[PDB]
Ligand binder design. Structure first.
Ligand SMILES: *[C@@H]1O[C@H](CO)[C@@H](O[C@@H]2O[C@H](CO)[C@@H](O[C@@H]3O[C@H](CO[C@H]4O[C@H](CO)[C@@H](O)[C@H](O)[C@@H]4O)[C@@H](O)[C@H](O[C@H]4O[C@H](CO)[C@@H](O)[C@H](O)[C@@H]4O[C@H]4O[C@H](CO)[C@@H](O)[C@H](O)[C@@H]4O)[C@@H]3O)[C@H](O)[C@H]2NC(C)=O)[C@H](O)[C@H]1NC(C)=O
Ligand SMILES: *[C@@H]1O[C@H](CO)[C@@H](O[C@@H]2O[C@H](CO)[C@@H](O[C@@H]3O[C@H](CO[C@H]4O[C@H](CO)[C@@H](O)[C@H](O)[C@@H]4O)[C@@H](O)[C@H](O[C@H]4O[C@H](CO)[C@@H](O)[C@H](O)[C@@H]4O[C@H]4O[C@H](CO)[C@@H](O)[C@H](O)[C@@H]4O)[C@@H]3O)[C@H](O)[C@H]2NC(C)=O)[C@H](O)[C@H]1NC(C)=O
Ligand SMILES: *[C@@H]1O[C@H](CO)[C@@H](O[C@@H]2O[C@H](CO)[C@@H](O[C@@H]3O[C@H](CO[C@H]4O[C@H](CO)[C@@H](O)[C@H](O)[C@@H]4O)[C@@H](O)[C@H](O[C@H]4O[C@H](CO)[C@@H](O)[C@H](O)[C@@H]4O[C@H]4O[C@H](CO)[C@@H](O)[C@H](O)[C@@H]4O)[C@@H]3O)[C@H](O)[C@H]2NC(C)=O)[C@H](O)[C@H]1NC(C)=O
Ligand SMILES: *[C@@H]1O[C@H](CO)[C@@H](O[C@@H]2O[C@H](CO)[C@@H](O)[C@H](O)[C@H]2NC(C)=O)[C@H](O)[C@H]1NC(C)=O
Ligand SMILES: *[C@@H]1O[C@H](CO)[C@@H](O[C@@H]2O[C@H](CO)[C@@H](O)[C@H](O)[C@H]2NC(C)=O)[C@H](O)[C@H]1NC(C)=O
Ligand SMILES: *[C@@H]1O[C@H](CO)[C@@H](O[C@@H]2O[C@H](CO)[C@@H](O)[C@H](O)[C@H]2NC(C)=O)[C@H](O)[C@H]1NC(C)=O
Ligand SMILES: *[C@@H]1O[C@H](CO)[C@@H](O)[C@H](O)[C@H]1NC(C)=O
Ligand SMILES: *[C@@H]1O[C@H](CO)[C@@H](O)[C@H](O)[C@H]1NC(C)=O
Ligand SMILES: *[C@@H]1O[C@H](CO)[C@@H](O)[C@H](O)[C@H]1NC(C)=O
Ligand SMILES: *[C@@H]1O[C@H](CO)[C@@H](O)[C@H](O)[C@H]1NC(C)=O
Ligand SMILES: *[C@@H]1O[C@H](CO)[C@@H](O)[C@H](O)[C@H]1NC(C)=O
Ligand SMILES: *[C@@H]1O[C@H](CO)[C@@H](O)[C@H](O)[C@H]1NC(C)=O
Lengths: 213, 106, 121, 89, 89, 213, 89, 213, 121, 106, 121, 106
């Protein structure tokens, strides 16, 4: 059924079921591992709005959860605290055990509102939402995560194979061609956002208007 | 682990009389008890299931009841055929028997 | 209709062994389970062991666990019992017995074989 | 497409066993300083094929999770191992 | 007793893999139209013995669940498999 | 310990532990499966009252849960929403993940009351309560299910092996020789129930008094 | 140090199968009278080494639990078994 | 990785990974077992205060849970129902499934208060807290338990291998060199506690002042 | 650039077998997946089976499951297809086809081989 | 499991006209549909991905849309080259085809 | 009472191998664990590897992982250490050392063997 | 992964004086530190466990303390025997040593 990857002579192969190995003795299980991977490696437009475009909502489907043992650093983590504009929550709480993605570089924390037509928040292409050593089909309320995927692997019997910035936002529409965005520096000072703006550029703007108020 | 207690050990009584027999246990049991008969050489026979459900082809004189640990077996209007030896089979947690109960005449 | 056939009796020395065979007819031999109970002379009863209606589940008394091996054959409408390492206490009348209930429940027994007064010396 | 041949990861020290007494919780760290942070600069196209592999694996993975009632799966790799055993025995 | 020799069931498509892109959740069905609905008209007494078998199995099954603290068991068949392995190896 | 069934030459056998197979290679696990089965196949009196007679209550025992992969269609599903006549709940809520029995034909939904002497609702003979791909020792509040059992099986390496009516009721006593029953057509129109009445007959009576009010 | 060479324990009857019909819940005990209470008077230093062994095992045990996200582990012994299989096959 | 113990010829050995056995066929898994063990066997000072000294509090660490199949009788069980002196709870509730340690001899139940600086209650040396067939890294609010450890074992294919007193207390400080203690006989009658006092001695004092009030 | 090479055609008897080989060039042969579709004369299309971009995942139509065995070779920039037990219905033009998307998604096909009008008698 | 329905079966029309073609299914589908062309002997060609995303190197006359089950394909200002046979490839759950759609002149 | 016996010294070529044996007496050899530490001349200390009190758990420093193999024998009241593939850096005084605590905890060491100034050429 | 820092490197001082020695680390540690002595040729000896628990058969002059990273070792009223070289053994996460600390006279 499911694929599985191997490491023979420090390089890669692939085999579902039928490809024998009279070589890989599979000495134990600690070499057998499962690995997450972020999509930043694929190099998508990792701005804020496309995220909203890369996602969606619906209902009738549950969440599901899975375990991996290791992943990748995050140049763009994401957390959300959103309510429907009536005042009710969009998202469900994060259950016990789950915690934010531990190892971030730019936490794109957000609040805002919008019609959350759907009691859960899936990825559009069917990606994951990568928490501490865990993935989901969906997002949980008020918790850091990252986008990524998973693979499963075998290893041979030789070896094994920090600031955490905060960033804030506001927005509306939120799953719409009318979706709005804003960037925080202060209580009051905000700005209309563009896809151009990087974390570094906005971090720089924590000096410009940080001086000019 | 559980043990029964037939009581009385036996009886020496005559036809037409009514008799009850008791059967106790070391632990509480539901209506999951049985009764039997057999004679000195005969293969046995079943009498009641669950402690009250009479069997087919049996006189209605045969009757018993109880719950927990105390359990009974009352029969009026005896017969010669009724003077077999009778037994009390637990089947709650293990199919346990006990000392049995013999019958005779004076 | 229910026609048990308890095999005859045989003498076996202490420590020996034996294969009993009780046969049955008059019903669906598979739909019901069977067991074994013994009565030594001048004694009461004692459950031995039991089987599912199909042979998956086995159940043995503690006193004879491992010493005795129950088995049946649905196809032949036949029961068996293999036994070994036999002590003097095993001298008794072993009966093949049928349940009241059906489908490997209801240990309480409906019928009773003829019995076989097995002996040791 | 784009692909980062380099890699930097955050494994756990499930073993390695470079351990004194800090294994105890009460005197141990909370949740951090616990994940080893290993780097990598090996074969470049290796990891590109790897990222590819994961992106492909996603499909059957979702089908699997869809195809149960479990919330928090943990039983995959054990199942794969025993599958391999049968596939060899 | 009564016994329906016929049978009609609701399996899942755990595999079968007749899959396009609907494996994704967001564009997939909710919980229905997902279970294959296979029919059966094979050997009649087969399924009667089968129903019998389940009714018998119930006993040890309850004893097992009684004999743990787990709520939501999922580990049976894996245990049976590895038991069979040992029983052969 | 536990039994297990096999399929050799498209027919059945049985084996606990000791019966070898030098034949069944057991190529994989997807062939290894676990199956639920409804008691309708055994053909009991599948009326409403005997259900109450086929069940009971107690306490001191927990619930337990188990997984199966497939089962059987239901000619009689059952759901319950019952309170103690004082006003308190009899049953506990259904935890997360669990959902109604998916594939029904006659949903015998019910409400009512009665002394629920026992904080859980077991089956009497020790059957199950079959939810979506899951069984229980007990019932959960406000959720469809069915009665049935389970078996475990191996298969060879060849192959693999809609309306959902609603029905409503009321009742009291509920675990008693004094248990009462009623059948709904309207807000007000009900009837004293009998074990004779089938789903089809009552469905027909959704025409007779549906006309005569 | 001190060490009790004697031992008295509270196992379960996971099997033993000395069972009638009380396996059913509704007519069964609640949670008690279910654990067998076996005694022991075997080799004295045996159990002292045993207690020692557990006290040693604690370390890797905590590291393991620390090294996951599971709450309620149940998968240890199965993992050990399959490890032994690989170690032999 | 992890150790594991064996029973060859009714005595003990040890082996992590590499020590073969061409002998132990490992016929099945029911022989494979996991066992808890109480520290009373090691014979520590099993008074009340040292418990508080044998423990502590912190935060940032989760709880973890594990299963064993059997353990040991308890000459000293322990249960706790403690709040911070402000009035708030110290401990978290015991989740579902978990229950008190079943098999006790002297239940040293307690209440009291004190600064519970740390949202969880670990053992100091890194022991366990042994509930019904389960251990924890921590304690749960209002539940019996015991202190102990675990080992894992194999067995060969031969065989397998009551009052529950109540006791009550009060105390403050509770993780301090200022920790106080009291022993209950009545509503009002208490006494300053000493490490000398055993369960038997205090049980005797349920006669002395039980007479003298 | 994208240069499929559908092999030539061969006659095979009923029940026989065959190994197709389509070759490709003009891109990263590994980054994309492939499949097979057939068109009998005077007929529409019919998907046969498909592969991952690397060979892990396979996918087969129901009508030919087990009868046909897909395979590729990333190193040789080559596709294959092994087939057997062949019926008359299999007489058709089998095309090697490339996806629009990349990395074993997007079954919808970009390119089309030349086709080979396979026959049975 | 799913089946399509090309409609109309074909057309016999002339240059410059505008034509739409429909394509239905037995079950609801997103914008996960495609279109093709091929001629009596020619290897086919792709036209649209997702039901609206036109391909490279294709005239802009080619256009279609829809959702759920109903799906369209509208082309104005036809050509001789446009008079191939066209097809409608599901790829929601299985890469399904159907009866295709032929084109000609009076 | 605690009487360590560090073995004598031997010269071994580079890449060679060796089996050390430290013996002990004065206590329960099983109840305590042991380890190895080295001091090259004019240098400080360096932990090598360690063992449980019974031999289950092993622990090795990173610098020598796989190169060195610790072992003991509870029955003989004896320690060992197998080593191989030896470099020049390994030239040092290897001590067998006992813990303060008991039962395979308390890496901090109570006693110290005599040491053996192992060499490479 | 963790590293220590003995400080001072050594000392050249005379009898009767009191001396403290420091010992730092790269990461915070509890009272899980030790101290030792050894001379140019002698097998070493233990002095303190846990950073304050003195050993048996040792003068009470030996004393130290600390927490986290900073850790001390104060001894009044020195002796000739006290003029060995001393060391500082981490045992928090790995049994780490460092540069040691030598003693002498002017
Ligand atoms: C595996 O599959 C088998 C079927 O192949 C199935 O066996 C079935 O078990 C049930 C449970 O016993 C059987 O039903 C029993 O039927 C007897 C006799 O039936 C006649 O009489 C009853 C009552 O008069 C009528 O309703 C019926 O229509 C028939 O005319 C009943 O007497 C039994 O009822 C008593 O015992 C039951 C078991 O406790 C109780 O459920 C019931 O309430 C009754 O007990 C009450 O009265 C007792 C009197 O002493 C009292 O002591 C009790 O405390 C209580 O108050 C029962 O209904 C059914 O016939 C069996 N089927 C077959 C074909 O034999 C297994 O159940 C199944 N395994 C599993 C796990 O499901
Ligand atoms: C495995 O790894 C691969 C990469 O190697 C990755 O494939 C990537 O998939 C995404 C999803 O389709 C691709 O993004 C698409 O890009 C096309 C074309 O890009 C140009 O045009 C868009 C839009 O104008 C620009 O934004 C872009 O910058 C380019 O200029 C887009 O047209 C696609 O958008 C439509 O389709 C998407 C799929 O549904 C939707 O997300 C999107 O909203 C658009 O759909 C909308 O419009 C439709 C019009 O008919 C309408 O029908 C819909 O209902 C909806 O309203 C899309 O953004 C990306 O290019 C792929 N990467 C590569 C290298 O090809 C896989 O996703 C990855 N696997 C997993 C599981 O992650
Ligand atoms: C495996 O099994 C072994 C037993 O075979 C068991 O080892 C036991 O470990 C405990 C924990 O250290 C040992 O108890 C220590 O005993 C010493 C000395 O005992 C005397 O002195 C104490 C205190 O004066 C008296 O109470 C006692 O009755 C004796 O007279 C104590 O000094 C230790 O206390 C200090 O260290 C402990 C470890 O942190 C702390 O729990 C305690 O609070 C003290 O620390 C405090 O003071 C320090 C002073 O510097 C300070 O730095 C700290 O921060 C803190 O404030 C300790 O009580 C016991 O003797 C060992 N048993 C044997 C036979 O040796 C293992 O624990 C067991 N494994 C597991 C996992 O359980
Ligand atoms: C933008 O930069 C300012 C400083 O230039 C940040 O304000 C400092 O925040 C840190 C911790 O976040 C505090 O320790 C300093 O005291 C703050 N300094 C002043 C002058 O306020 C500010 O947090 C940055 N913006 C964001 C969104 O993080
Ligand atoms: C009895 O039958 C009536 C119709 O004959 C049902 O009422 C219809 O219910 C459906 C959906 O349940 C609605 O779409 C119709 O509009 C209803 N029609 C009328 C005239 O009310 C009624 O639901 C049936 N009874 C039950 C219990 O289901
Ligand atoms: C101290 O002993 C008294 C009796 O000597 C206990 O009081 C009895 O408690 C039992 C159950 O706990 C009751 O059934 C009796 O009726 C009580 N008798 C009296 C006279 O009160 C008392 O519980 C003991 N103390 C503790 C803390 O258990
Ligand atoms: C492993 O691969 C390297 C180059 O990648 C090659 O030099 C070596 O011979 C290979 N060895 C084996 C055993 O395949
Ligand atoms: C506004 O910012 C200040 C710090 O600059 C902070 O104290 C205050 O709580 C903030 N208020 C809101 C509403 O965010
Ligand atoms: C399988 O069973 C069928 C009849 O059920 C029989 O004809 C056939 O010979 C059997 N084959 C084997 C291999 O047992
Ligand atoms: C009574 O029935 C009508 C529909 O016929 C419905 O609108 C109403 O809510 C019902 N009321 C109650 C109390 O069930
Ligand atoms: C087992 O140990 C006993 C003593 O403990 C000894 O007499 C016997 O020979 C041993 N047998 C084996 C097979 O080791
Ligand atoms: C005091 O003790 C009596 C029993 O002796 C009991 O009824 C009462 O509830 C107790 N009160 C408190 C506050 O504990």
């Amino acid at each position: 059924s499911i694929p599985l990857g191997v490491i023979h002579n420090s390089t890669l192969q692939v085999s579902d079921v039928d490809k024998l190995v009279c070589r890989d003795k599979l000495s134990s299980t600690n070499q057998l591992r499962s690995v997450g991977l972020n999509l930043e490696g694929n190099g998508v437009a990792t701005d804020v709005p496309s995220v909203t475009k890369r996602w969606g909502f619906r209902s009738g489907v549950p969440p599901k959860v899975v375990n991996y043992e290791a992943g990748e650093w995050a140049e763009n983590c994401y957390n959300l605290e959103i309510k429907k504009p009536d005042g009710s929550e969009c998202l469900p709480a994060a259950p016990d055990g789950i915690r934010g993605f531990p190892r971030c570089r730019y936490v794109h924390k957000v609040s805002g509102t919008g019609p959350c037509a759907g009691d859960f928040a899936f990825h559009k292409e069917g990606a994951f939402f990568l928490y501490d050593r865990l993935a989901s089909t969906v997002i949980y309320r008020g918790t850091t995560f990252a986008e990524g995927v998973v693979a499963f692997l075998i290893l041979p019997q030789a070896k094994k194979d920090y600031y955490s910035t905060t960033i804030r936002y506001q927005a509306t529409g939120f799953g719409t061609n009318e979706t709005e965005y804003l960037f925080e520096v202060d209580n009051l000072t905000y700005v209309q956002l563009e896809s151009r703006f990087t974390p570094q550029f906005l971090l720089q703007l924590n000096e410009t208007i940080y001086a000019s108020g | 682990d559980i043990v029964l207690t037939q009581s009385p050990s036996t009886l020496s009584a005559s036809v037409g009389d009514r008799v009850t027999i008791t059967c106790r246990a070391s632990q509480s049991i539901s209506s999951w008890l049985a009764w039997y008969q057999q004679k000195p050489g005969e293969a046995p026979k079943l009498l009641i299931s669950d402690a009250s459900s009479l069997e087919s082809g049996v006189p209605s004189r045969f009757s018993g009841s109880g719950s927990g640990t105390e359990f009974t077996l009352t029969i009026s209007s005896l017969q010669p055929d009724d003077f077999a030896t009778y037994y009390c089979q637990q089947y709650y947690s293990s199919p346990t028997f006990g000392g049995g109960t013999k019958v005779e005449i004076k | 209709q229910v026609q048990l056939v308890q095999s005859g009796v045989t003498l076996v020395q202490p420590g020996g062994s034996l294969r009993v065979s009780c046969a049955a007819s008059g019903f669906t031999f598979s739909s019901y389970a069977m067991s074994w109970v013994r009565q030594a002379p001048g004694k009461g009863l004692e459950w031995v062991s039991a089987i599912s209606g199909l042979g998956g589940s086995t159940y043995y008394a503690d006193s004879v666990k491992g010493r005795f091996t129950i088995s049946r054959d649905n196809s032949k409408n036949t029961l068996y019992l293999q036994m070994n390492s036999l002590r003097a206490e095993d001298t008794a009348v072993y009966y093949c017995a049928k349940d009241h209930r059906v489908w490997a429940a209801g240990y309480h027994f409906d019928y009773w074989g003829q019995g076989a007064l097995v002996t040791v010396s | 497409p784009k692909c980062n041949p380099n890699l930097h990861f955050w494994t756990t020290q499930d073993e390695g066993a470079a351990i004194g007494l800090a294994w105890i919780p009460y005197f141990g760290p909370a949740a951090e300083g616990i994940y080893t942070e290993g780097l990598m600069h090996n074969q470049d196209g290796l990891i590109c094929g790897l990222r590819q592999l994961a992106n492909e694996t996603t499909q059957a993975l979702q089908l699997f999770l869809r195809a149960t009632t479990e919330l928090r799966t943990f039983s995959i790799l054990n199942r794969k191992a025993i599958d391999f055993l049968l596939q060899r025995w």
